[PDB]
Amino acid sequence: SINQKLALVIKSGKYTLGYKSTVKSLRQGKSKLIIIAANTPVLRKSELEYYAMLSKTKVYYFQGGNNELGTAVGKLFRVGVVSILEAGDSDILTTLA
Amino acid sequence: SQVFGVARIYASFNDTFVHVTDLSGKETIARVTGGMKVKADRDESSPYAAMLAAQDVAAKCKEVGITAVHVKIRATGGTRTKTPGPGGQAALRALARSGLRIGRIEDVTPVPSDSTRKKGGRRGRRL
Amino acid sequence: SGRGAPLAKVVFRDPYKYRLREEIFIANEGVHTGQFIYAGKKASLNVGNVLPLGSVPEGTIVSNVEEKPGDRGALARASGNYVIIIGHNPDENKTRVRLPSGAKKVISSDARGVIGVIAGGGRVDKPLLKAGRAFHKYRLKRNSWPKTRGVAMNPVDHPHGGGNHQHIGKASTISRGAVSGQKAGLIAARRTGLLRG
């Protein structure tokens, strides 16, 4: 369910992968949702909510580490955090998950 | 009107126990076994040995105050015969003979959910 | 050096003056650097924490247990070893435990232990393969190695010594009341022979 919503965003919507580009998009206000890997360090993770809380953008806590999140977004590397720039044909933003 | 004990008749093969206790079962009152009443080693579990072994139990229940008994008949149970031995029936009839009142007869054979592999080997006890 | 289990250097703040006090714990398996240890009566039941025995449930696996409250750890200190809390006796508070050797011990419920198993377990599973690895193992411990067999010696050197063949000549099982110089063999043996009931 969550994975197929992620795959639909990657297929149809626009997104950024990684810490630095996610925080830049959080600064610029272009992020509708942030998905955070389970094994992301707590300091970076709290840094990400504080940015997200400042910009009023939703935070979803992915179940699975950076390997699993990278696989979910269809990548062959780890991603510790993904930012959804705008959902495409996907209801990821509307569905609470 | 009456004073109750518990008979706890264990009727295995090769023996029978007539073990009267209090209601709690903590205090023994006249435990008499069939091996006490005969000397042949063939008929400790016989109905006659059970008759005598329950007759003197009830002769002891009176003069101590037990006037009625709840009976719990027992087989060996566990991984064994599960069938009450021959002596259990004579002991129960002997208790009823002996003027003791009877109430709430029950079978308390230990029945497992099959466990602890039965003795005898795979081919069983062949003679 | 000389210890199979690794050690955890844990830093605490002194409660009574501004400074940090360091401690040398025996690291339990699963304890990592940067992890927060919590040591007290009100500590959580998590690996690495230090708790009183009376405040852990049945079946809890602890290590470096205090034999007496305050002695700072006596029981289950070697790699892979642990103590099982097997019962509580709340009145005149005592806790029944199972030691690594299998003995049942009654400790005060206020004695402390560390949740988990001593790290480095499985060490003796690997054969040493050669004298040199035993040499380096004992070079860091003490001068107990190599060992000469008493029968290989002369009678002046050992009760097993002498003879025109290498043999012991009297029973190797020695009374508990024998005196120093006599206690070479199997002392106070209740039985001998291959352990086979």
Partner: protein
């Protein structure tokens, strides 16, 4: 090309000490020289530094584990039992 049929790493011991002993060592040396996934940074960068000390070459995190493996089965069972009792306390 497959340089050895079965000795593998224990071919360094030549023909001595006995085949069963060399086999026993071989299983534990392969465990103790393997790379393991970091539970912290998700990278397969955990190597042994000494018996019981497993250090991730990235993120510099060091964990205490088995003599020849990062985690022993006994340690895994103790983790689950401690978690079970902790949730019983916290329930």
């Amino acid at each position: 090309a497959k340089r050895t049929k079965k000795v593998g790493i224990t071919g360094k011991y030549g023909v001595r000490y006995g085949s069963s002993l060399r086999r026993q060592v071989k299983k534990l040396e392969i465990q103790q020289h393997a790379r393991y996934d970091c539970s912290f940074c998700g990278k397969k960068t955990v190597k042994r530094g000494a018996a019981g000390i497993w250090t991730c070459s990235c993120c510099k995190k060091t964990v205490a584990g088995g003599a020849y493996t990062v985690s022993t089965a006994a340690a895994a069972t103790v983790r689950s039992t401690i978690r079970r009792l902790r949730e019983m306390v916290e329930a």
